[PDB]
């Protein structure tokens, strides 16, 4: 063949922490289809918003927004348990079909994004060069987000285990845990990845009695 219909940029969705997660890679030949199962980032979430992105930047806000839609009717469950299957499907028409499906409630929502959406040829090259020019900063952000998300799970799991523990946890330790939790929460708001890591370790340090109780 002398030519191919290909994606000139990555297509994906925004995920926890404000990152773009890619579903169809840059330079994928069409037709193509890809599905992936995701879950929730907190306990009892009843709906999710699927924010569709085009581009090459790691921070979702720096990509081109193609659309969004909701999937509601998610049964309340602990975080990470619901199964939300997100499908990107682009056939020869160059129309992007995005669906999200709750594999338990069976509820599904879909949208279509026409061939003309997203960046034009000039904006496509600028986006590729902006990605290049900011590669440094983009990778730091990706690593910081992975660390943030890991700290967030630890914070929230520790808080659950304190609840289940009740008066079984010594007042002394309960107070020391609560302190470390607050410090980690503070470190999470910042941009210093090592500081989050030290606060994760410091919280696990004071949790020994808590972990035995569980």
């Amino acid at each position: 063949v002398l030519l191919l219909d290909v994606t000139p940029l990555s297509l994906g969705i925004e995920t926890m922490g404000g990152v773009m997660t890619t579903l169809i890679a840059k330079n994928t030949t069409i037709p193509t289809k890809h599905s992936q199962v995701f879950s929730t980032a907190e306990d009892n979430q009843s709906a999710v918003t699927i924010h569709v992105l085009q581009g090459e930047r790691k921070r979702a806000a720096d990509n081109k927004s193609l659309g969004q839609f909701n999937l509601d009717g998610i049964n309340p469950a602990p975080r990470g348990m619901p199964q939300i299957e997100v499908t990107f499907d682009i056939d020869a028409d160059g129309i992007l079909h995005v669906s999200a499906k709750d594999k338990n409630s069976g509820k599904e929502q879909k949208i279509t994004i026409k061939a003309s959406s997203g960046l034009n040829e000039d904006e496509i090259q600028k986006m590729v060069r902006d990605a290049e020019a900011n590669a440094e900063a983009d990778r730091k952000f990706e690593e910081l987000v992975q660390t943030r998300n890991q700290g967030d799970h630890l914070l929230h799991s520790t808080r659950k285990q304190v609840e289940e523990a009740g008066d079984k946890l010594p007042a002394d330790d309960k107070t020391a845990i609560e302190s470390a939790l607050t410090a980690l929460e503070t470190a999470l708001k910042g941009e210093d990845k090592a500081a989050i890591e030290a606060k994760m370790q410091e919280l696990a340090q004071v949790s020994q009695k808590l972990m035995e109780i569980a």
């Binding site: 404000g18 995701f38 929730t40 907190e42 709906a47 918003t49």
Partner: peptide, 8 residues
């Protein structure tokens, strides 16, 4: 590494 969608 499992991934999660944010709360709306």
């Amino acid at each position: 590494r499992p991934v999660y969608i944010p709360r709306p």
